[PDB]
Structures are given as structure tokens and as C-alpha cells.
Amino acid sequence: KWTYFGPDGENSWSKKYPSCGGLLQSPIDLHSDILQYDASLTPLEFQGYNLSANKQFLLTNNGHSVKLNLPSDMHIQGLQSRYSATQLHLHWGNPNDPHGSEHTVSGQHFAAELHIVHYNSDLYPDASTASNKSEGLAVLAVLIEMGSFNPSYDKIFSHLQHVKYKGQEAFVPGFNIEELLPERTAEYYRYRGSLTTPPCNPTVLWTVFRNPVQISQEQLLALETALYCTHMDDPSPREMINNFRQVQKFDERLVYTSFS
Amino acid sequence: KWTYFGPDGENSWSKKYPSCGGLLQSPIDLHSDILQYDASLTPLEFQGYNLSANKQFLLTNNGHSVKLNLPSDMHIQGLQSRYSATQLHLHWGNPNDPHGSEHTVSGQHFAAELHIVHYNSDLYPDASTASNKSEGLAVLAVLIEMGSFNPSYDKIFSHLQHVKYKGQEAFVPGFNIEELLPERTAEYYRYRGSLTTPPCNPTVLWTVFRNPVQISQEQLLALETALYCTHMDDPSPREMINNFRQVQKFDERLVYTSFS
Ligand SMILES: COC(=O)c1cc(S(N)(=O)=O)c(SC2CCCCC2)cc1Cl
Ligand SMILES: COC(=O)c1cc(S(N)(=O)=O)c(SC2CCCCC2)cc1Cl
Ligand SMILES: [Zn+2]
Ligand SMILES: [Zn+2]
């Protein structure tokens, strides 16, 4: 067990999950002193992101976030290996502090953050097996700003009702997962990092898009109030809020950018 | 052992120093949504700060920071008890990322931060004994930005060459410690917090002056490049940089200000 508040919190994670006190931890603050323009950061290709609205995909409350299972037929081109999707999920704040992005920009949090998680399908059979192995993982991060209502993000959020408690699951219609992406996906930050959650394996090629997407106040209120870390029948219920890790030390790293 | 990098780093502190995973952890980000003017916050007076240039004071590289031992008749007046000085030390970044303050203001890191550590001499013989006791410690924090040359900070930085390596020690003629303080010391943030290093005891009444001081990039650079964490004869020498804790989560809690 582990949480984002009090004894079992992120300062305690290392007690049980040693890579949590290891090198190359995410997330981090994106600021100009540690950015490095790199001409080898070519645009990524989003293959098989257009999911049929006639097909269903599983939304799950895992106690930590809400996650949507993705088919491995969907993948990234543009990296050293093929990276097949496994799932997406979100991190957010709370009604009183709607600033729960993991990555910050110049010390500022965004409202929230979407993570699209892929595994190295050329080396490993599944995300689990890739999880603690070199070149195992590749996450796309999308910074989320409070703004206009997002009909595309709502294809996830209109179902939060059915996954209020840890272990609950609802089938959700396919949609074009590229609609979750901001503009100029060719402008991104790139760096070597980790799971932002235990076991914090240092096995993740991070790609954080430069531009944020927008979701409304109401969407954030809904995401910040819908969900519990706890089973429906737990007598110590904990609201699923502030499910974000503090930015980490750079350990001599740079953040390579596709823009200058 | 404990460091600010690698296996023994701040995320691992909780293993041997459980308070580092506990309550009231410092440092924090000071942002308006958690600031409340409290009109009761009157100026502190600093008694005995004017150390005679007649008298010499020990400067130690302890492998975490440069530290200047201060005399105990040096003290804060204005608190609920008398708080006597034990030492001052600094935190800083690295030449490539010169943002090494512990506290941040609206997510911004300052160049460096000076801590003048006082203990409750009314109740406790020394700061060591005070350190795990309720209301044992009061620290004064000064935020440092790059700007004009600072002749009074130079009274410390002039001697850094005598304490390059860990365990090294130099005598510094006394000066007025009150010259290390910024403009309008009446303007400060006040909260209940912890030590920012192990054992992270939640025993510290924090006072962080509103206004930064300036030191020249030459002053700042000397500090960033002058010292090593390692003994003279350590075959693998480690530069002393980034000796600052990541800001902690600050939940359902307020920072008071003496300014509206
Ligand atoms: C609130 O945080 C999360 O719940 C979460 C966060 C991540 S993250 N932010 O990408 O590190 C992953 S990815 C990982 C899960 C375990 C095995 C490999 C895939 C999965 C999850 Cl389920
Ligand atoms: C770079 O960090 C340090 O070197 C440091 C930083 C602090 S701080 N930031 O004030 O917690 C203390 S506190 C001192 C109080 C007396 C007994 C324990 C150590 C001691 C030290 Cl040794
Ligand atoms: Zn995530
Ligand atoms: Zn300190």
C-alpha cells in the first residue's frame, strides 16, 4: 500500500520501493536553465489511436487514479523501438487547489496532467514485464489548463460515475485518442525518468508536449470529486485527490527540446 | 550518512530518520492562496548580532554546507521565549542552474538561502538537545538573488578557500550578523515547520524575510564552485552543489505574514 498523504506518502515510498530513492526520478520542473535543443527530436507518429466508437475499452479505479486500458495495436513510431500502448490515466489537485499536474513549467503547476503509457513491444510481451527493464516504457504527458469544456476529455469524464470506488470498472466507447493531444505535438520536451508512482522504476522515456489542452472548471470539479482511493465498503474512505508527486532532483540530467 | 544525491538522497531520508516522512515538513512554496496577514506579527529584535572584529568565529565545511558557529548570547527577542544562536549555513544550486533556495515564492527558486539557527535557551542547554523538543528551534531564512556586490556576505565568502574539503575549518573575524539580513526585517513569512535536513524534526518556528538580499554573480559563483562534500584525500571528489531539499506538500495549513 502507498498514498500521496501522510505516513505512507511519497517521502515514505523508498522504505518499500527502493527505486523511489534512486536516480532519474520524475517528475521535474521544466525551466530554461536545463533545456537543450536537439535536432534528432523528430515528430512522433500516433498509429491506431483512432479507436472505434463501436468498440468498448475498460475504465478502472485502481485506488490511485482512473485508468482506461488501451489495445497494444495502438502505438508510437519515432522512437528507437516500437512502443505499444497499455493504458492512460490522469493526475489532479482538489476543489480548493486545482493545480495537480506532475511536471511544472517554471515552478507553476497546471490544473492536471494526462499520461499515455506505452511499453517496448520489441523487447517485452507486456507493460508489467517491461516495467523494471531497460528501455521498458515511454509515456506521453499532456499538461491540462482550466479553460473551455473539452468534449473529447468528457468521453472519459462522463463515466467517472461508474468507477467511484477502488476496483470498479466500466466499459467506455472507443474514440480518437489523438483528440486528447494538444496542438503541435512536434513541439515537446524529452528526458530519461521513472514511474511517478511506486515502484518508481527509472525505465521511462518521458515526452511532455509543449502546449497544454483545456478542460473546464466543471470537468475538473467532477474529476476532483468523483473518485475514492478506497473500496466502496472501506470504513476509512480516502477521497482520490492531490494524486501528484513533487518535482524531483535533476541528477545531472538535461531536458532535450524539439524547439528553441 | 545522508546526502542530497543518489541512494542516500532526500527521498531515502525517512528510512533512518522517520520524521522526514512525518508532519510539518519544510521547505514549502509561499503562494498568496495560503498567505494570511496576522497583525500580531511585530518586528523581531536581534541582540548580540554585532560580533567584534576583535573576536574570531569557526567556519566549517561539514560535507553538507559551510557553517559559521555563532555565540549563544546572540539572540532573538520578540518570541514567546528567548532563542539563542547556534550557527548559520547556506543552501545553493549549481553554476548551470543557479536556483538553490529552499523556500520558493510563487514556485520561483531564489539563487541561495541563509539560515541562522536559534534554539530555545529558556528551556534547553544547546540546540542539539532543543532539536527534537516542542518549539525547540526558531530559524531565520534570507532569500538571496543575484545583484550588487555584498561586502558583508563577502566577510564569509572571502574564507571559502580555507574550507574547500570536508572537516576543514577557518576562523572568521566577527562582524554584525544583522548586515546579512535584508531591507525591512519587519516584513516576513511565519509558519510551523521542520528541519530541512535529517532528522527533519518538526520543531522549527520558521521566519522567512519577505525581501531578498543581493550578491554578485562572482559572489554566487564562488559559493557554487568553492567547496566539495568529500575529504581532501577522497579519490572520487564530489562538488558541493544543490544542497537544498525539494519543497514539501503543504496541505490544509496556512503561512502567516507580517505584511498585508
Ligand atoms: C496516480 O498514478 C497512477 O495510478 C499511475 C501512474 C503511472 S505513471 N505516472 O505513468 O508512472 C503508471 S505507469 C506503470 C504502472 C505500473 C507498471 C508499468 C506501467 C500507472 C499508474 Cl496506474
Ligand atoms: C546544508 O544543510 C545543513 O548543513 C544544515 C541545515 C540545517 S537546517 N536547514 O536549519 O535544518 C541544520 S539545523 C541544525 C540545528 C541544530 C541541530 C541539528 C542541525 C543543520 C545543518 Cl548541518
Ligand atoms: Zn501518471
Ligand atoms: Zn538550512
Numbering used by the authors:
A (entry chain B), B (entry chain A): 4 to 50, 50A, 51 to 54, 54A, 54B, 55 to 74, 78 to 81, 84 to 102, ...
Sentences reproduced from the published study:
We compared the crystal structures of several compounds in two different CA isozymes. Figure 2B shows the binding mode of 3b and 3d in the active site of CAXII. The binding modes of both ligands in the active site of CAXII were the same: ortho groups were directed to the hydrophobic part of the active site, while meta substituents were orientated to the hydrophilic part. The binding affinities and enthalpy changes to CAXII were almost identical (ΔGintr = −62.3 kJ/mol, ΔHintr = −48.0 kJ/mol (3b) vs. ΔGintr = −61.1 kJ/mol, ΔHintr = −50.1 kJ/mol (3d), Figure 2B). The positions of the compounds were similar. However, the binding affinities of 3b to CAIX and CAXII differed significantly and were 150 times stronger to CAIX than CAXII (Kd_intr = 0.030 nM or ΔGintr = −62.3 kJ/mol to CAXII and Kd_intr 0.20 pM or ΔGintr = −75.0 kJ/mol to CAIX). Again, the side chains interacting with 3b in CAIX and CAXII were different. They were more hydrophobic in CAIX (A203, L135, V131, L91, and Q67) and more hydrophilic in CAXII (N204, S135, V131, T91, and K68).
